[PDB]
Structures are given as structure tokens and as C-alpha cells.
Scaffold this motif. Structure first.
Motif, PDB file in Angstrom:
ATOM      1  N   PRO A  90       0.770  -1.422   0.075  1.00 40.03           N
ATOM      2  CA  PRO A  90      -0.103  -0.014  -0.539  1.00 40.03           C
ATOM      3  C   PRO A  90       0.737   1.456   0.078  1.00 40.03           C
ATOM      4  O   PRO A  90       1.513   1.845   0.824  1.00 40.03           O
ATOM      5  N   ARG A  91       0.875   2.286  -1.203  1.00 39.03           N
ATOM      6  CA  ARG A  91       1.386   2.935  -0.908  1.00 39.03           C
ATOM      7  C   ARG A  91       1.141   4.836  -0.731  1.00 39.03           C
ATOM      8  O   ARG A  91       2.017   6.022  -1.122  1.00 39.03           O
ATOM      9  N   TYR A  92      -0.789   4.462   0.146  1.00 43.29           N
ATOM     10  CA  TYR A  92      -1.061   6.146   0.719  1.00 43.29           C
ATOM     11  C   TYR A  92      -0.964   6.568   1.692  1.00 43.29           C
ATOM     12  O   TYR A  92      -1.519   6.978   2.616  1.00 43.29           O
ATOM     13  N   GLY A  93      -0.700   4.895   2.278  1.00 44.38           N
ATOM     14  CA  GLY A  93      -1.138   5.262   4.238  1.00 44.38           C
ATOM     15  C   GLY A  93       0.198   5.353   4.680  1.00 44.38           C
ATOM     16  O   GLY A  93       0.608   6.161   4.674  1.00 44.38           O
ATOM     17  N   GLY A  94       0.164   4.545   6.175  1.00 43.03           N
ATOM     18  CA  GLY A  94       1.781   4.814   6.634  1.00 43.03           C
ATOM     19  C   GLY A  94       2.673   3.734   5.406  1.00 43.03           C
ATOM     20  O   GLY A  94       2.177   2.896   4.574  1.00 43.03           O
ATOM     21  N   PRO A  95       3.493   3.937   6.265  1.00 43.27           N
ATOM     22  CA  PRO A  95       4.686   2.751   6.133  1.00 43.27           C
ATOM     23  C   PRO A  95       4.081   1.507   5.469  1.00 43.27           C
ATOM     24  O   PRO A  95       3.499   0.833   6.020  1.00 43.27           O
ATOM     25  N   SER A  96       4.461   0.656   4.702  1.00 47.06           N
ATOM     26  CA  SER A  96       3.743  -0.364   3.703  1.00 47.06           C
ATOM     27  C   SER A  96       3.984  -1.152   4.936  1.00 47.06           C
ATOM     28  O   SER A  96       5.271  -2.227   5.076  1.00 47.06           O
ATOM     29  N   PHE A  97       3.087  -2.117   5.174  1.00 41.93           N
ATOM     30  CA  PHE A  97       3.094  -3.647   6.110  1.00 41.93           C
ATOM     31  C   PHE A  97       3.800  -2.949   6.962  1.00 41.93           C
ATOM     32  O   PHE A  97       3.715  -4.142   8.611  1.00 41.93           O
ATOM     33  N   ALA A  98       3.979  -2.129   7.906  1.00 38.84           N
ATOM     34  CA  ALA A  98       4.481  -1.281   9.095  1.00 38.84           C
ATOM     35  C   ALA A  98       3.424  -1.482  10.378  1.00 38.84           C
ATOM     36  O   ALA A  98       2.592  -0.492  10.164  1.00 38.84           O
ATOM     37  N   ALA A  99       3.743  -2.468  11.030  1.00 40.00           N
ATOM     38  CA  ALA A  99       2.823  -2.338  12.722  1.00 40.00           C
ATOM     39  C   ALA A  99       3.777  -1.744  14.250  1.00 40.00           C
ATOM     40  O   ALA A  99       4.585  -2.895  13.911  1.00 40.00           O
ATOM     41  N   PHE A 100       3.166  -0.466  14.212  1.00 40.55           N
ATOM     42  CA  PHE A 100       4.765  -0.145  14.767  1.00 40.55           C
ATOM     43  C   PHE A 100       4.193   0.705  16.217  1.00 40.55           C
ATOM     44  O   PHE A 100       2.739   1.008  15.286  1.00 40.55           O
ATOM     45  N   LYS A 101       5.308   0.697  17.460  1.00 41.14           N
ATOM     46  CA  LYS A 101       3.946   2.101  17.738  1.00 41.14           C
ATOM     47  C   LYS A 101       4.721   3.500  17.547  1.00 41.14           C
ATOM     48  O   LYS A 101       6.327   3.429  17.905  1.00 41.14           O
ATOM     49  N   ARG A 102       4.549   4.393  17.536  1.00 45.15           N
ATOM     50  CA  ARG A 102       5.199   5.800  17.263  1.00 45.15           C
ATOM     51  C   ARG A 102       5.207   6.942  18.342  1.00 45.15           C
ATOM     52  O   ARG A 102       3.525   6.743  18.979  1.00 45.15           O
ATOM     53  N   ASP A 103       5.783   8.078  18.782  1.00 43.95           N
ATOM     54  CA  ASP A 103       5.435   8.358  20.030  1.00 43.95           C
ATOM     55  C   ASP A 103       4.728  10.211  19.087  1.00 43.95           C
ATOM     56  O   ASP A 103       4.227  10.169  17.412  1.00 43.95           O
ATOM     57  N   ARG A 104       4.353  11.250  19.982  1.00 40.21           N
ATOM     58  CA  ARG A 104       3.456  12.154  19.724  1.00 40.21           C
ATOM     59  C   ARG A 104       4.678  12.715  17.889  1.00 40.21           C
ATOM     60  O   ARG A 104       3.869  13.406  17.801  1.00 40.21           O
ATOM     61  N   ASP A 169      10.483   6.321  -2.114  1.00 36.08           N
ATOM     62  CA  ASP A 169       8.929   6.633  -3.230  1.00 36.08           C
ATOM     63  C   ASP A 169       8.062   5.912  -2.984  1.00 36.08           C
ATOM     64  O   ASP A 169       7.455   6.053  -3.866  1.00 36.08           O
ATOM     65  N   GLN A 170       8.210   4.343  -2.831  1.00 34.19           N
ATOM     66  CA  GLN A 170       6.816   3.453  -2.684  1.00 34.19           C
ATOM     67  C   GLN A 170       6.204   3.167  -1.417  1.00 34.19           C
ATOM     68  O   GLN A 170       6.289   2.419  -1.562  1.00 34.19           O
ATOM     69  N   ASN A 171       6.646   4.372  -0.542  1.00 29.54           N
ATOM     70  CA  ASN A 171       5.733   4.403   0.960  1.00 29.54           C
ATOM     71  C   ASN A 171       6.434   2.886   1.777  1.00 29.54           C
ATOM     72  O   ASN A 171       5.999   2.149   2.703  1.00 29.54           O
ATOM     73  N   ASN A 172       8.091   2.323   1.395  1.00 33.08           N
ATOM     74  CA  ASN A 172       8.463   1.431   2.728  1.00 33.08           C
ATOM     75  C   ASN A 172       8.761   2.136   3.182  1.00 33.08           C
ATOM     76  O   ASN A 172       9.932   3.088   3.335  1.00 33.08           O
ATOM     77  N   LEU A 173       8.890   1.505   4.628  1.00 33.50           N
ATOM     78  CA  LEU A 173      10.031   2.004   5.367  1.00 33.50           C
ATOM     79  C   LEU A 173      11.210   1.654   4.852  1.00 33.50           C
ATOM     80  O   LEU A 173      11.615   0.952   4.290  1.00 33.50           O
ATOM     81  N   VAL A 174      12.021   2.791   5.271  1.00 30.07           N
ATOM     82  CA  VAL A 174      13.226   2.227   5.514  1.00 30.07           C
ATOM     83  C   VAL A 174      14.600   2.792   6.652  1.00 30.07           C
ATOM     84  O   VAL A 174      14.242   3.989   6.645  1.00 30.07           O
ATOM     85  N   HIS A 504      10.582  -5.425  16.791  1.00 25.97           N
ATOM     86  CA  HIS A 504       9.622  -4.091  17.286  1.00 25.97           C
ATOM     87  C   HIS A 504       8.745  -3.979  16.237  1.00 25.97           C
ATOM     88  O   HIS A 504       6.874  -3.601  16.751  1.00 25.97           O
ATOM     89  N   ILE A 505       8.861  -3.896  15.001  1.00 24.47           N
ATOM     90  CA  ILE A 505       8.110  -3.559  14.400  1.00 24.47           C
ATOM     91  C   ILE A 505       7.620  -4.855  13.679  1.00 24.47           C
ATOM     92  O   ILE A 505       8.221  -5.641  13.404  1.00 24.47           O
ATOM     93  N   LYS A 506       6.506  -5.021  13.895  1.00 24.79           N
ATOM     94  CA  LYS A 506       5.547  -6.087  12.748  1.00 24.79           C
ATOM     95  C   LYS A 506       5.027  -5.884  12.223  1.00 24.79           C
ATOM     96  O   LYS A 506       5.131  -5.132  11.212  1.00 24.79           O
ATOM     97  N   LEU A 507       4.636  -7.305  11.430  1.00 23.49           N
ATOM     98  CA  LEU A 507       3.582  -7.107   9.958  1.00 23.49           C
ATOM     99  C   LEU A 507       2.222  -7.139  10.501  1.00 23.49           C
ATOM    100  O   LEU A 507       1.637  -7.245  10.672  1.00 23.49           O
ATOM    101  N   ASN A 508       1.257  -6.298   9.468  1.00 19.49           N
ATOM    102  CA  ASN A 508       0.070  -6.082   9.482  1.00 19.49           C
ATOM    103  C   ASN A 508      -0.834  -6.328   8.322  1.00 19.49           C
ATOM    104  O   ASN A 508      -2.139  -6.619   8.242  1.00 19.49           O
TER     105      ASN A 508
END
Ligand SMILES: [Cl-]
Ligand SMILES: [Mg+2]
Length: 576
Positions: A90-104, A169-174, A504-508
Motif C-alpha cells: 500500500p502506497r498512500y497510508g503509513g509505511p507499507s506492511f508496517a505495524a509499530f508504536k510511534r510517539d507524538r 518513493d514506494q511508501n516503504n519504511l527505510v 519490534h516492528i511487526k507486519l499488518n
């Protein structure tokens, strides 16, 4: 004079070996393991050291005839280079396939709340310089620097920096790393790993090391903390293709990157195997110890030694009385633990050894933590050896080579990546010695392949091939931390893992996404191969109409009854 070369399985040049401590056409994944394995086999044969063996690889004018199929290796790298597009990232939401906790401030944190990956702009300025905010650095009257932040750590007089993430450029986490700096021998006083003071006698030999900006923030120079600008794309994946009949490695992919010298996760980074451990840690030993494919196991509430509802199946509930075939296909956790409780943990370690998961010789060259290696945190567990929740996990190479034993009529073959090494004169100085060991009977190997043939229709539609039969097992670890599929066709044995490098990062995507990619890998590997089915049953296997409630011969009026394969001498003789 001559230079050392690696060839493919068709004698074509693949690498000219040079010491870096023509134009390559494949990534360093396969060729690195060739050199690694050649070095090990060279030390064993000639009693060389790591340095002595590598001096022979570098300057010995050796020609290594590797097992690589360059077209399969090349094409699989095409797929991995296009990982984001093939897996429909997926290229429009958060980082592709990434499930994680973020701070403010959008930094990635662990479950507790500690930052593990900074957002690049929060850690680096416009010049790739680390900024330490006000209130976390202090300069005393002696022009010495005091840093007390989670962004910088010190250990053994070496300053280590935090790591940050970008989104490509492909919404993937790097995820990127920042280098380390060797602080001098004396001039630093430490309180904790995140609070330390550097004295001005160290900045004299540098001077360009730090700077306070217009906002009262400390700015450290990038010339001493090298910024990994390219980074590593996430999530990562690895595949291992293996000809189980010969043990020859056909292709190795250790990550999505296909340029430079990427980390070869296929054999260097173990991960949790999850339910892919069930076939070779539990049920394959069970079939040799009084179980049949029709053996009924009760999926009922199970409790640990401390009176706790462990384990829990993936389907929130219990399915009751299930045959061994269904218990493995449905990947029942209760039935796997109950079966490994009946047979021994020691009886299971025997198969870990035979499958190659435990190195019988060194036992420190493996990723299995024995009671000798540790008493607090060891792998002699029911969670480890039945459910795949291991202390360190197994590598993709070890899992594929173990499943290859099931595919090769129960006979394990040590995965080799080369067939001979030829010196300048032309004599074979090295020929791998394939540790061939029989893990289980030819009959049980067939039954296990037939059991796992029903897994794609239940949990891995993406693994099904149009014209060639596919058998395998899925593995999703706790919280979708790892996604696995390991299996085989009549032709090759393949293992595919997907996950984030930082666990710590999981898959959605809990839709067996490794199995979906496994099918894409398998279709590339099997290009041009004729339609083929698995080998038929041996003459030492009989079929009987049996009841799922017990295992006994079913008569008319039996509720649930199917025809199941039995090893001759293990089929039921009495009626329900
Ligand atoms: Cl279910
Ligand atoms: Mg060990």
C-alpha cells in the motif's frame, strides 16, 4: 598471477574474486555463501585458519565451480528488487506492511515506549549532522561536553549513535544507521551508557567536532559519525532454493537489496520459524514413534506447568478431536504441544540433529541454545521445539535444508553451493563432502508430503502452482513478527521468510504473505519445467478406510471416515 573466479553450474563466470577489505550480474548473496562455505571446507581439509583459508581464496588462483543457476538467481533478484510492486505494498497510508508504536513526534518506539528509530528530521539537520536538543547537553566552564540523551550511547570508549528511518518513493519504511566514533583512551568520564562527559583535551585533535546552533542545540559533525544514506528497505525477505535430490543450492536471496554488499539474511540472521517447526520438530518424529496420519489428538484447553492457559491456537477456540493430518494442516498449537509432550524433548533433539538444525560436531556453530550453552534461556523447550518460539531461531538455509530432507524421501543432504575447486595447474584441490543422513523412512516422508499438500488450500492459496504439485507449511510468529512458508515441489525445495529487521516492528498482513511471495518465487524457479506430480506411494504403504474419532477401521454407519495412508504394519486391524 591469475585471479580467483567463481562460476555457475554451467561454467559461466559469475565473480572475479578480489580483496576489498568484471561487471557483476548477480547480487553478492549467492557468491558470498560460496566463498564462506569454500573457506570452511578449506579449513577442515588443510587445517587452515580463517586468514590462511581466505589467503588461498584471494590469491591462490582458484576456480570455484558453484552450483548456482544464474538465470533463476537473476530472475529471483528481479522479483526481490520489485518487492514493493509484486506484493501490492500500500502506497498512500503509513509505511507499507508496517505495524509499530510511534510517539507524538513520529519516532518508532518499542512496546515499553523507548525510541528505537528516530524520524530523520528529529535526529539529523540539513547537513546529516546529529542535533542534541537543549537540556540534554551541557558545556561546563572547562569547555568540556556533557551529553545525557537517548540519542547517543557510549560503551568501551566508543560513541554509538541512534538509528533513524525514512520513507522511500514506494511508501516503504527505510531504516538507516549512523556510524560510531572511537573516543580516545582518556578524556571521558561515564555515568551510564546514555550520560557521559567529554573533556576538551579530546576536541583539540579534532576541533571541528561540535557546535551550538541558533536554537541552543548541540550539532555534532557528520565527518565523525558516518550517515548510512542509502539505508535498508523494510520489511525484508529472504528465499532459499534447493535441489533436494542432490542438496545443491540453486539460488539464494538474502534481502531485497541487489546492489553493493547487502546483508545475506538467508544464512546469517536467524529468525523465529514459528509453525514451520511443527513438521520436523514434532510430527515427523511422531510418525516414527507410534503415530499415524490418522492418529486422533484432542484440541482441548491445555495448561502449562504453572496452571496457565498455554498454548493458545490462532483460531481463538478449540477444534476438539483431530487427526494428525488435520492437526498439522490446521496448525493446531495444542495438538503440537501435546504430541511433543508424549514423545521426548530428547527424542525431538535427535531429529533437530538429523535435520541439521543442531550441529552434532561443534554445537556452537548452530543457532540452537542447549542446556549446556545456557540454563536460564535455552531452547530445550516446548515453545521452542513444538511451536517455533525459539531463543534465537533458525536461518532460512537451515529450515530449507531440513525440509529438503522430507522432499528427498527422508534423506538429508548437507546443502552445498559448489561442486569442485580447481587450482592454477588444473587439479581439484577441494570437493565438498556432503553429510548425507537419513532422517526418516521413505514411507513417512511421503505421508508427510501428502499431509502438507493440503496446507495451500487451507492457508496458502498464493503458494499453489498451475501445473506442478505444491506441498509446504506456513509459519506466522507471535504478533505477525515473522511470516514463513517452507515447502517443495517434485523439483526443488524452497523456503521464504518475510519480516522486519527490527523485530519490534511487526507486519499488518496476517494473510500468509510469505506464502504469497513463495508462490511467486516458485513460479520463477519452475519456469519451463514440465507439469509433474509428486512421486506415488511406495509398496510399503497401504490405504485403509478409517474413522477420525479413533484410528480404527471404519464400518458402515461411521460418522466421519476417510481413506488414509499407513505404513504397512501400522494400519489398524480392528473395527470401530
Ligand atoms: Cl479453524
Ligand atoms: Mg548450539
Amino acid at each position: 598471477i591469475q585471479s580467483s573466479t567463481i562460476l555457475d553450474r554451467n561454467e559461466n563466470l559469475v565473480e572475479k574474486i578480489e580483496n576489498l577489505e568484471f561487471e557483476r550480474e548477480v547480487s553478492t548473496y549467492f557468491t558470498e555463501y560460496v566463498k564462506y562455505q569454500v573457506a570452511e571446507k578449506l579449513m577442515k581439509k588443510f587445517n587452515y585458519t580463517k586468514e590462511e583459508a581466505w589467503d588461498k581464496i584471494y590469491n591462490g588462483g582458484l576456480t570455484i565451480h558453484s552450483t548456482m543457476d544464474q538465470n533463476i538467481q537473476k530472475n529471483l533478484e528481479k522479483l526481490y528488487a520489485d518487492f514493493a510492486n509484486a506484493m501490492n505494498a500500500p502506497r498512500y497510508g503509513g509505511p507499507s506492511f508496517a505495524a509499530f508504536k510511534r510517539d507524538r513526534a513520529s519516532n518508532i518506539t518499542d512496546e515499553k515506549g523507548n525510541i528505537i528509530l528516530y524520524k530523520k528530521a528529529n535526529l539529523l539537520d540539513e547537513n546529516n549532522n546529529v542535533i542534541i536538543p537543549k537540556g540534554e547537553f551541557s558545556i561546563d566552564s572547562d569547555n568540556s561536553l556533557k551529553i545525557n540523551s537517548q540519542r547517543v550511547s557510549i560503551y568501551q570508549n566508543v560513541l554509538s549513535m541512534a538509528s533513524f528511518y525514512t520513507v522511500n518513493d514506494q511508501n516503504n519504511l527505510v531504516t538507516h544507521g549512523i556510524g560510531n566514533f572511537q573516543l580516545p583512551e582518556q578524556g571521558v568520564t561515564v555515568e551510564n551508557e546514555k550520560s557521559f562527559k567529554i573533556s576538551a583535551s579530546v576536541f583539540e585533535n579534532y576541533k571541528d567536532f561540535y557546535s551550538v546552533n541558533e536554537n541552543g542545540n548541540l550539532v555534532l559533525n557528520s565527518k565523525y559519525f558516518q550517515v548510512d544514506e542509502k539505508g535498508t528497505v523494510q520489511p525484508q525477505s529472504s528465499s532459499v532454493v534447493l535441489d533436494h535430490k542432490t542438496g545443491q543450492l540453486i539460488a539464494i536471496i538474502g534481502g531485497r537489496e541487489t546492489t553493493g554488499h547487502p546483508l545475506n539474511r538467508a544464512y546469517r540472521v536467524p529468525r523465529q520459524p514459528g509453525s514451520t517447526m511443527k513438521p520436523l520438530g514434532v510430527y515427523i518424529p511422531a510418525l516414527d514413534n507410534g503415530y499415524t496420519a490418522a492418529t486422533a489428538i484432542e484440541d482441548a484447553p491445555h495448561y502449562n506447568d504453572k496452571k496457565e492457559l498455554w498454548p493458545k491456537n490462532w483460531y481463538n477456540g478449540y477444534r476438539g478431536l483431530q487427526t494428525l493430518r488435520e492437526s498439522l494442516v490446521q496448525s493446531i498449537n495444542v495438538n503440537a504441544v501435546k504430541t511433543l509432550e508424549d514423545i521426548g524433548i530428547e527424542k525431538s533433539k535427535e531429529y533437530f540433529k538429523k535435520f541439521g538444525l543442531i550441529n552434532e560436531d561443534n554445537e556452537l556453530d548452530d543457532t540452537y541454545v542447549s542446556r549446556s550453552e545456557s540454563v536460564d534461556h535455552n531452547d530445550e523447550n516446548l515453545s521452542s521445539m513444538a511451536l517455533g518460539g525459539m531463543t534465537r531461531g533458525m536461518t532460512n538455509l537451515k529450515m530449507t535444508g531440513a525440509y529438503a530432507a522430507i522432499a528427498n524421501d527422508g534423506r538429508y543432504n548437507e546443502p552445498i553451493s559448489f561442486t569442485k575447486v580447481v587450482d592454477s595447474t588444473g587439479k581439484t584441490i577441494l570437493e565438498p563432502e556432503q553429510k548425507q543422513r537419513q532422517v526418516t523412512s521413505k514411507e513417512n516422508a511421503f505421508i508427510m508430503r501428502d499431509i502438507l499438500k493440503g496446507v495451500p488450500d487451507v492457508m496458502a492459496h498464493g503458494a499453489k502452482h498451475p501445473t506442478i504439485e505444491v506441498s509446504g507449511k506456513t509459519g506466522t510468529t507471535d504478533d505477525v513478527q515473522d511470516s514463513w512458508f517452507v515447502g517443495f515441489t517434485p523439483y526443488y525445495t524452497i523456503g521464504t521468510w518475510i519480516g522486519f529487521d527490527n523485530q519490534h516492528i511487526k507486519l499488518n498482513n496476517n494473510n500468509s504473505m510469505a506464502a504469497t511471495l513463495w508462490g511467486k518465487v516458485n513460479r520463477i524457479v519452475l519456469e519451463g519445467k514440465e507439469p509433474k506430480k509428486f512421486d506415488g506411494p511406495s509398496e510399503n504403504i497401504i490405504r485403509k478406510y478409517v474413522s477420525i474419532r479413533t484410528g480404527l477401521l471404519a464400518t458402515e454407519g461411521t460418522e466421519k471416515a476417510i481413506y488414509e495412508y499407513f505404513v504397512k504394519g501400522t494400519e489398524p486391524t480392528k473395527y470401530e
